[PDB]
Amino acid sequence: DIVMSQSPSSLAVSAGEKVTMSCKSSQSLLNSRTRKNYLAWYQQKPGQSPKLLIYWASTRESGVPDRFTGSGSGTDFTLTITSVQAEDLAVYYCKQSYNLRTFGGGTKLEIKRADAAPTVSIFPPSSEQLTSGGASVVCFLNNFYPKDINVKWKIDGSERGVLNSWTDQDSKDSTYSMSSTLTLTKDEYERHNSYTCEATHKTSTSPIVKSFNRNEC
Amino acid sequence: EVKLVESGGGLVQSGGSLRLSCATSGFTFTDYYMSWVRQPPGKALEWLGFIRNKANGYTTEYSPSVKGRFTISRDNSQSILYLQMNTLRAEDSATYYCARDHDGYYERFSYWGQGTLVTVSAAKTTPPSVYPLAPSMVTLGCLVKGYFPEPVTVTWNSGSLSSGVHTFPAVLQSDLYTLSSSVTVPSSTWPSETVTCNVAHPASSTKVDKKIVP
Numbered sequence: 001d002i003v004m005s006q007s008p009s010s011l012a013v014s015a016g017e018k019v020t021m022s023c024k025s026s027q028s029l030l031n032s033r034t035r036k037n038y039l040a041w042y043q044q045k046p047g048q049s050p051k052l053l054i055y056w057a058s059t060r061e062s063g064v065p066d067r068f069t070g071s072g073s074g075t076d077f078t079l080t081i082t083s084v085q086a087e088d089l090a091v092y093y094c095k096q097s098y099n100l101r102t103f104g105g106g107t108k109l110e111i112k113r114a115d116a117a118p119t120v121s122i123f124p125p126s127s128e129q130l131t132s133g134g135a136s137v138v139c140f141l142n143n144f145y146p147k148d149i150n151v152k153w154k155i156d157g158s159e160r161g162v163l164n165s166w167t168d169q170d171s172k173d174s175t176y177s178m179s180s181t182l183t184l185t186k187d188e189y190e191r192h193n194s195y196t197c198e199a200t201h202k203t204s205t206s207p208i209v210k211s212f213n214r215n216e217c
Numbered sequence: 218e219v220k221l222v223e224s225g226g227g228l229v230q231s232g233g234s235l236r237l238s239c240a241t242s243g244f245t246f247t248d249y250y251m252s253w254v255r256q257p258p259g260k261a262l263e264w265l266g267f268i269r270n271k272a273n274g275y276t277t278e279y280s281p282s283v284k285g286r287f288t289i290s291r292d293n294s295q296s297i298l299y300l301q302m303n304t305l306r307a308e309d310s311a312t313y314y315c316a317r318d319h320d321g322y323y324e325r326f327s328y329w330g331q332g333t334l335v336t337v338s339a340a341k342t343t344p345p346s347v348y349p350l351a352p353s354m355v356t357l358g359c360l361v362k363g364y365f366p367e368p369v370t371v372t373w374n375s376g377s378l379s380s381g382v383h384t385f386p387a388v389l390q391s392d393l394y395t396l397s398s399s400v401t402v403p404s405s406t407w408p409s410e411t412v413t414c415n416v417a418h419p420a421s422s423t424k425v426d427k428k429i430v431p
């Protein structure tokens with residue numbers, strides 16, 4: 001086999017700065033007959049298929065921004081992105097085609113940006129869920145940076161069945177969002193009145209508090 | 218325009234077989250090698266195999282990881298590529314992509330399909346419950362709860378609302394997936410203008426439109 005290895009595993013860069021990542025092969029990929037390196041680079045944006053960027057080590061495919069440049073030869077290859085843009089958030093894969101094909105393990109490129117506070121929204125259980133015997137309360141914490149965030153649920157003022165999920169970084173504004181869902185039985189839901197989502201994020205020493213009261217529904 | 222479209226993914230039991238298809242158009246199919254590549258959720262791409270072009274006798278090659286167990290074939294009359302998978306195991310759960318490959322000259326995979334998700338599991342198919350999430354800018358949502366297998370698709374107003382949407386990755390809890398989706402719109406536009414989430418679960422052929430009512 002030919003072993004393909006990429007570095008770094010991951011990194012974050014601010015818009016406008018340069019990105020360098022590398023790809024090593026266990027064997028030279030330089031074909032002696034054609035005098036080309038059989039090494040290609042693919043970009044996979046979140047939720048998308050991979051897209052060809054560079055092939056033969058340094059040939060930039062038509063339609064690919066000028067800021068992407070492939071270089072290297074033999075066993076060592078480099079993808080350089082100058083003036084990185086928010087939309088360049090992706091996992092980048094190199095792939096040899098010298099002997100069958102083999103992909104590297106990828107480099108995950110994240111985008112660094114200015115800290116941003118979450119916009120927090122809370123939602124009570126729908127009547128169509130309650131009819132069924134369950135009660136989910138949902139809290140969205142949207143468009144914040146950096147990714148680290150704390151969420152606490154309080155029920156009648158006391159801290160408490162939680163599903164947390166983070167989006168991939170946003171391709172436009174480089175923020176993260178998170179959804180937190182508390183699920184109770186209808187029977188337990190109806191024993192209490194106040195339901196509160198509290199978000200603590202580095203952007204404030206004050207937690208952002210969103211609440212509803214069951215009597216107000 | 219070159220088009221590659223995979224089909225055939227879904228839920229299958231351990232030890233079972235499944236055959237994927239990849240319909241193509243927009244290029245001279247027989248001129249090209251075609252590859253299959255897979256990606257387990259959150260992991261790296263893995264090349265699986267290829268079938269050569271007409272000039273090379275349409276012969277096949279395979280990664281050691283699947284040689285002897287997966288078979289690639291092609292219909293040169295209709296420009297369709299196939300992957301037959303046998304004795305499936307949990308490790309085979311992944312998104313499967315077809316990619317256009319070598320033409321005798323260029324070294325590149327020029328084009329890739331959207332991928333088809335295969336889930337190898339003993340669990341039964343369970344359709345989602347879909348619940349509306351109602352309360353300058355206003356944020357609304359849909360909770361898509363308790364389904365299996367992945368995937369689901371969520372759009373808002375049949376795809377006309379796309380900016381200001383966050384669809385959260387599904388999370389598995391006690392053998393069922395749940396996800397949610399939020400949409401943020403101007404407060405002057407709701408409930409004056411309608412907001413509806415459109416949810417599909419192909420495994421159970423579920424189609425739901427949920428109006429967000431004040």
Ligand SMILES: C=CCO[C@]1(C(=O)O)C[C@@H](O[C@]2(C(=O)O)C[C@@H](O[C@]3(C(=O)O)C[C@@H](O)[C@@H](O)[C@@H]([C@H](O)CO)O3)[C@@H](O)[C@@H]([C@H](O)CO)O2)[C@@H](O)[C@@H]([C@H](O)CO)O1
Pocket residue numbers: 031097098099100269272273274319320321322324
């Ligand atoms: C009717 C079948 C003809 O194929 C051969 C033969 O053995 O008779 C094989 C030729 O094979 C190559 C070659 O230069 O060795 C390789 C072919 O590419 C692939 C492969 O199919 O394994 C795939 C490429 O991505 C790359 O990995 C290469 C390697 O770099 C090795 O070269 O392998 C392909 O490039 C063919 C080309 O279509 C020939 O036109 O060449 C070669 O011996 C040909 C001969 O030129 C007559 O057609 O016959």
Ligand SMILES: [Zn+2]
Pocket residue numbers: 188191192
């Ligand atoms: Zn209680």
Ligand SMILES: [Zn+2]
Pocket residue numbers: 276277
């Ligand atoms: Zn052969």
